[PDB]
RNA sequence: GUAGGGGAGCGUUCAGUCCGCGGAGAAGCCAUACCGGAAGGAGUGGUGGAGCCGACUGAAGUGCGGAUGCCGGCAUGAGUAACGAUAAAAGAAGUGAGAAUCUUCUUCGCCGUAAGGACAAGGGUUCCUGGGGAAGGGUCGUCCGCCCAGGGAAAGUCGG
RNA sequence: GCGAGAGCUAACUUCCGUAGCCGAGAGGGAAACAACCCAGACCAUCAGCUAAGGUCCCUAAAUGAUCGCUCAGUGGUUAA
RNA sequence: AAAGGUGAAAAGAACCCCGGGAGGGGAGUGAAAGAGAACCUGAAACCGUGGACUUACAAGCAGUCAUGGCACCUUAUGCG
């Protein structure tokens, strides 16, 4: 152990498994639909739905899933026939904004805003289970 | 006229939201160039749907 | 020189807070409405509090009279009988006497009688 | 309680120019792609079309010639695929759904000769 | 025990002293079953990365749930209502990472005292070429009046 | 509540007297209920006695004892 | 009008992987990348993911008291 910065600098902190998609410009409440079929089953069936799967949603939580299947199989070494989503999940964004309805309390009323609220990050694990 | 009286809670309205959820499709293995399609139509992969369809 | 409300007011806040619990939704939360549920609950507290002992004196009661019925007396006629006898300042909480220890309670049962004629 | 035989999606002028224009052309390919609803329309309206053209005389030419309106079109059905056509006990168009569609996210299909 | 009066005090910024603590890590933030009659105050554990408790005295822009209070942020209504004229569109072909929407062909419907054409005012490179795909476009986008760069505008007689 | 006026010897009325409560008063009773009945909460207690009120079951406490009444659900709507 | 902060120092991320991209995962530099250019801390509202105990005859200012079940034992086997 020793201490604080003695931890922190004799160990690197990995990530295993993971891979986030940040800012795809998307509301996040859409993209968990999509997500939550993904969540649970191997990575193949992942990758079969997803293609399949008619949100167009789907379209980066696949770009992702596959991403996070590479990290998996060249960076942690691991086994693709072992492969499952351990967990995914969505949120946050930074809500996009120009700024352009200068808003005097009127005239234009309340409307746009356009949620940069995607965040979508998958994390694959081996099951070994069996 | 006529808005709502309070918000909801998160509670009530998730609630709702209950119904929402995905269906997501079921599928199958192509018997010609296996890889999976989708029910009483052609496989994209290679295009075969008893014997052979569209070229892909 | 200024004195800025900083971390003064987020602490005392954080306080009232924490004393909300297994409070449901809006009042566990966000602080306003947990304070003024904790109102209430001062309110519901030291009155409860001076309560639990009409509680329990009713329940003890409840108990006493019902074994004094299993033996053919009633609590009227059982702390009668009992304190009519000298021998007996015995009273409180004696109902686990009469639900834990049936012999005893009759014995303080057959004591009432003798007490009475 | 809406009871009838026939399905409209545009107006009334609409669905004739359309589907005359859906048949003139799966005549002319052979096989076109279109959305699967319209292409279920679009079956029985040019399977008569087929019957009309065989029989053979000006009559039906003529017949044929209302609805097609592209003289090579209707001499392709007429000489060409009428014909063609003889012992078949009528019918033949088939049709076979591709897949969903990115957009609008409608099924698509094709329909072929 | 309400206005109201009286008494003791808690906490926060600054200042002067006093004592000190901190890279083997300050304040701040996070959790927490301990302490105190209350305001409150410590114990340790997690964050942090350059500073800071305790004591005494003094000075205050010194304590928020309210004011249809102010700036900000984020909810509810909800994946609702809408997507801005009921002049319909259709197939093939092309390109591309991806096309209902961009390109071409062939048809279709619409204006035609216009919904065609030419100028004035006003706008200010919006024109053309080659790119580009963030945002802008009410969907999409390979596309554009958007983004980048380069080019283009010629007068003795027209208007001044 | 009492003692008067205005009023209709009406008003959860209006205006003076007069005690008490509410106001600024929590606790028990009156099903619920400012004022009414009992009682003014310094703090703790899984101890005891009582007040108004109650002691068939919702609810703690006699389905008490003795002499009547009332057969109407009077009780638990008013009068000539 | 609002609008400040990598790091001591640019050493500001060669190279590799998924992707048109955006974005991230490694490697490397660094005390630290628990500093990565949406670069000090990073509260709260607010959205999620996983877990523990729970909920589909019950009339609910969300609490309060009393007991039982269940789970957990760093101010912490007890008045938890
Ligand atoms: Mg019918
Ligand atoms: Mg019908
Ligand atoms: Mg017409
Ligand atoms: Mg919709
Ligand atoms: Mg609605
Ligand atoms: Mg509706
Ligand atoms: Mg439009
Ligand atoms: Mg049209
Ligand atoms: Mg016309
Ligand atoms: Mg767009
Ligand atoms: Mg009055
Ligand atoms: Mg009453
Ligand atoms: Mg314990």
Same mark, same amino acid.
């Given at each position: 152990?020793?201490? $604080? #910065?003695?931890?922190?600098?004799?160990?690197?902190?990995?990530?295993?498994?993971?891979?986030?998609?940040?800012?795809?410009?998307?509301? *996040?409440?859409?993209?968990?639909?999509?997500?939550?079929?993904?969540?649970?089953?191997?990575?193949?069936?992942? !990758?079969?739905?997803?293609?399949?799967? *008619?949100?167009?949603?789907?379209?980066?939580?696949? $770009?992702?899933?596959?991403?996070?299947?590479?990290?998996?199989?060249?960076?942690?070494?691991?086994?693709?026939?072992?492969?499952?989503?351990?967990?995914?999940?969505?949120?946050?964004? *930074?809500?996009?904004?120009?700024? +352009?309805?200068?808003?005097?309390?009127?005239?234009?009323?309340?409307?746009?805003? #356009?949620?940069?609220?995607?965040?979508?990050? +998958?994390?694959?694990?081996? &099951? %070994?289970?069996? | 006229?006529?808005? *709502?009286?309070? $918000?909801?809670? &998160?509670?009530?309205?998730?609630?709702?939201?209950?119904?929402?959820?995905?269906?997501?499709?079921?599928?199958?293995? =192509?018997?010609? =160039?296996?890889?999976?399609?989708?029910?009483?139509?052609? =496989?994209?992969? =290679?295009?075969?749907?008893?014997?052979?369809?569209?070229?892909? | 020189?200024?004195?800025?409300?900083?971390?003064?007011?987020?602490?005392?806040?954080?306080?009232?807070?924490?004393?909300?619990?297994?409070?449901?939704?809006?009042?566990?939360?966000?602080?306003?409405?947990?304070?003024?549920?904790?109102?209430?609950?001062?309110?519901?507290?030291?009155?409860?509090?001076?309560?639990?002992?009409?509680?329990?004196?009713?329940?003890?009661?409840?108990?006493?009279?019902? %074994?004094?019925?299993?033996?053919?007396?009633?609590?009227?006629?059982?702390?009668?009988?009992? #304190?009519?006898?000298?021998?007996?300042?015995?009273?409180?909480?004696?109902?686990?006497?009469?639900?834990?220890?049936? !012999?005893?309670?009759?014995?303080?049962?057959?004591?009432?009688?003798?007490?009475?004629? | 309680?809406?009871?009838? %035989?026939? $399905?409209?999606?545009?107006?009334?002028?609409?669905?004739?120019?359309?589907?005359?224009?859906?048949?003139?052309?799966?005549?002319? !390919? %052979?096989?076109?792609?279109?959305?699967?609803?319209?292409?279920?329309?679009?079956?029985?309206?040019?399977?008569?079309?087929?019957?009309?053209? &065989?029989?053979?005389?000006?009559?039906?030419?003529?017949?044929?010639?209302?609805?097609?309106?592209?003289?090579?079109?209707?001499?392709?059905?007429?000489?060409?695929?009428?014909?063609?056509?003889?012992?078949?006990?009528?019918?033949?168009?088939?049709?076979?759904?591709?897949?969903?569609?990115?957009?609008?996210?409608?099924?698509?299909?094709?329909?072929?000769?």
């Amino acid at each position: 152990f020793r201490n $604080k #910065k003695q931890r922190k600098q004799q160990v690197k902190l990995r990530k295993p498994g993971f891979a986030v998609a940040k800012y795809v410009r998307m509301s *996040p409440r859409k993209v968990r639909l999509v997500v939550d079929v993904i969540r649970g089953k191997s990575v193949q069936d992942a !990758e079969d739905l997803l293609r399949f799967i *008619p949100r167009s949603a789907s379209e980066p939580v696949a $770009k992702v899933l596959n991403s996070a299947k590479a990290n998996a199989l060249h960076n942690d070494e691991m086994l693709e026939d072992r492969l499952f989503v351990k967990e995914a999940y969505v949120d946050a964004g *930074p809500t996009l904004k120009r700024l +352009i309805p200068r808003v005097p309390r009127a005239r234009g009323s309340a409307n746009i805003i #356009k949620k940069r609220t995607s965040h979508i990050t +998958i994390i694959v694990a081996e &099951k %070994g289970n069996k | 006229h006529p808005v *709502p009286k309070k $918000k909801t809670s &998160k509670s009530k309205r998730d609630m709702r939201r209950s119904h929402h959820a995905l269906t997501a499709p079921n599928l199958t293995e =192509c018997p010609q =160039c296996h890889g999976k399609k989708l029910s009483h139509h052609i =496989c994209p992969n =290679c295009g075969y749907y008893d014997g052979r369809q569209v070229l892909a | 020189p200024r004195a800025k409300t900083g971390i003064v007011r987020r602490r005392r806040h954080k306080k009232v807070l924490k004393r909300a619990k297994g409070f449901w939704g809006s009042r566990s939360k966000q602080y306003r409405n947990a304070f003024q549920t904790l109102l209430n609950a001062a309110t519901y507290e030291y009155r409860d509090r001076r309560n639990k002992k009409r509680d329990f004196r009713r329940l003890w009661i409840q108990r006493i009279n019902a %074994g004094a019925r299993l033996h053919g007396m009633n609590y009227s006629t059982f702390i009668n009988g009992l #304190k009519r006898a000298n021998i007996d300042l015995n009273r409180k909480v004696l109902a686990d006497i009469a639900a834990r220890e049936p !012999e005893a309670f009759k014995a303080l049962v057959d004591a009432s009688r003798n007490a009475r004629q | 309680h809406g009871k009838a %035989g026939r $399905k409209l999606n545009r107006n009334s002028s609409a669905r004739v120019a359309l589907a005359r224009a859906q048949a003139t052309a799966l005549l002319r !390919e %052979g096989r076109i792609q279109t959305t699967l609803t319209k292409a279920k329309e679009l079956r029985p309206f040019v399977e008569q079309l087929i019957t009309t053209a &065989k029989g053979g005389d000006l009559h039906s030419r003529r017949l044929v010639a209302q609805d097609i309106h592209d003289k090579d079109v209707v001499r392709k059905v007429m000489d060409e695929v009428a014909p063609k056509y003889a012992e078949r006990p009528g019918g033949y168009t088939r049709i076979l759904r591709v897949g969903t569609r990115r957009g609008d996210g409608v099924t698509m299909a094709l329909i072929e000769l």
